[PDB]
Amino acid sequence: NTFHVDFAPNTGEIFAGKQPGDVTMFTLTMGDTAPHGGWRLIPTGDSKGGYMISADGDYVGLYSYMMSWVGIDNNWYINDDSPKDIKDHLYVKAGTVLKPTTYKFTGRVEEYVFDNKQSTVINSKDVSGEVTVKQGLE
Ligand SMILES: OC[C@H]1O[C@@H](O)[C@H](O)[C@@H](O)[C@H]1O
Ligand SMILES: [Br-]
Ligand SMILES: [Br-]
Ligand SMILES: [Br-]
Ligand SMILES: [Br-]
Ligand SMILES: [Br-]
Ligand SMILES: [Br-]
Ligand SMILES: [Br-]
Ligand SMILES: [Br-]
Ligand SMILES: [Br-]
Ligand SMILES: [Br-]
Ligand SMILES: [Br-]
Ligand SMILES: [Br-]
Ligand SMILES: [Br-]
Ligand SMILES: [Br-]
Ligand SMILES: [Br-]
Ligand SMILES: [Br-]
Ligand SMILES: [Br-]
Ligand SMILES: [Br-]
Ligand SMILES: [Br-]
Ligand SMILES: [Br-]
Ligand SMILES: [Br-]
Ligand SMILES: [Br-]
Ligand SMILES: [Br-]
Ligand SMILES: [Br-]
Ligand SMILES: [Br-]
Ligand SMILES: [Br-]
Ligand SMILES: [Br-]
Ligand SMILES: [Br-]
Ligand SMILES: [Br-]
Ligand SMILES: [Br-]
Ligand SMILES: [Br-]
Ligand SMILES: [Br-]
Ligand SMILES: [Br-]
Ligand SMILES: [Br-]
Ligand SMILES: [Br-]
Ligand SMILES: [Br-]
């Protein structure tokens, strides 16, 4: 139906070492023309807390442009009631060291409405993806 969510790895290449600037790991598009109050992304499994987890066992924090992180609630959220798509990127900060391995994210997107000074979920979707960082030519 009207609710839609698309979570994908970035369509380009990520290279190992110190990131020379903020680097997008994943894109998140979500929208609904039906009435609603906002959206949240809840990291699940080993991503709990807002992390990617690498095949080497390292946790790397992710940041959002469009959403705000609330650690109390293990979620990013944005309050938006418009019918237009929200286009966000989850990124790693400039200077972050990445290793040439696979980094995974798993989470759940929820769309919610407001009532009784709180909120109620009206739709949800599990999302996941991975980026395999390349060494680059040496
Ligand atoms: O304003 C609504 C938001 O409130 C935050 O405190 C919560 O973590 C989000 O999930 C969302 O419900
Ligand atoms: Br969908
Ligand atoms: Br998806
Ligand atoms: Br979509
Ligand atoms: Br691609
Ligand atoms: Br790739
Ligand atoms: Br680079
Ligand atoms: Br997307
Ligand atoms: Br509609
Ligand atoms: Br979980
Ligand atoms: Br290692
Ligand atoms: Br770590
Ligand atoms: Br953030
Ligand atoms: Br936090
Ligand atoms: Br917090
Ligand atoms: Br609380
Ligand atoms: Br949770
Ligand atoms: Br607000
Ligand atoms: Br707010
Ligand atoms: Br749109
Ligand atoms: Br947007
Ligand atoms: Br963005
Ligand atoms: Br680092
Ligand atoms: Br390594
Ligand atoms: Br309310
Ligand atoms: Br009510
Ligand atoms: Br109320
Ligand atoms: Br709530
Ligand atoms: Br709430
Ligand atoms: Br609920
Ligand atoms: Br639901
Ligand atoms: Br699902
Ligand atoms: Br997905
Ligand atoms: Br993927
Ligand atoms: Br290789
Ligand atoms: Br390397
Ligand atoms: Br290679």
Task: Provide the CATH number for the domain around residue 86.
Answer: 2.60.40.3590
Q: Total structural domains in the chain?
A: 1
As a whole number of Å, the end-to-end CA separation of the chain is 49
Q: 3-class secondary structure for the chain?
A: CCCEEEEEECCCCCECEECCCCEEEEEEEEECCCCCCEEEEEECHHHCCCEEEECCCCEEECEECCCEEEHHHCEEEEECCCCCCEEEEEEECCCCEECCCEEEEEEEEEEEEEECCEEEEEEEEEEEEEEECECCCC
What does this entry list as its resolution, in Å?
Answer: 1.5
d(CA 7, CA 9) in angstroms, rounded, equals 7
Paired with 6 in beta bridges are: 29
Instruction: Specify the experimental method.
Output: X-ray
d(CA 135, CA 14) in angstroms, rounded, equals 9
Asked if residue 24 lies in contact with residue 10, where contact means CB atoms within 8 angstroms, the answer is yes
d(CA 40, CA 73) in angstroms, rounded, equals 10
Measured in Å, residue 31 CA sits from the centre of ligand 1 at 17
d(CA 23, CA 35) in angstroms, rounded, equals 33
CA angle 50, 93, 63 (to 5 degrees): 30
Q: Write out the residue range of the structural domain in which residue 90 sits.
A: 1-138
User: How do strand 102-115 and strand 38-43 relate by DSSP bridges?
Assistant: antiparallel
Measured in Å, residue 127 CA sits from the centre of ligand 32 at 7
Which ligand approaches the C-alpha of residue 108 most closely? Answer: 32
